[PDB]
């Protein structure tokens, strides 16, 4: 199941993933805390995201 961004997010460290509201993301790791490793299906990039900025999609 993929996720969608509810807000834009600008990276705050190099290995974060920046994204835009509406962007579809694959959650790759969600067992390390509030920050999840995600892969953008729109841009192809991968990095950490704040889990409270995204929601389950279709």
């Amino acid at each position: 199941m993929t996720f969608v961004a509810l807000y834009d997010y600008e990276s705050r460290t190099e290995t974060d993933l920046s994204f835009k509201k509406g962007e579809r993301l694959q959650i790759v790791n969600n067992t390390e805390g509030d920050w999840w490793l995600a892969h953008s299906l729109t841009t192809g990039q991968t990095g950490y995201i704040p889990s409270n900025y995204v929601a389950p999609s279709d």
Binding site: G33, D34, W35, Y48, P50, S51, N52, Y53
Partner: peptide, 12 residues
């Protein structure tokens, strides 16, 4: 926008 959460526990 929502408050950002603290960074995850770093692994050693």
């Amino acid at each position: 926008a929502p408050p950002l959460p603290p960074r995850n526990r770093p692994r050693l």
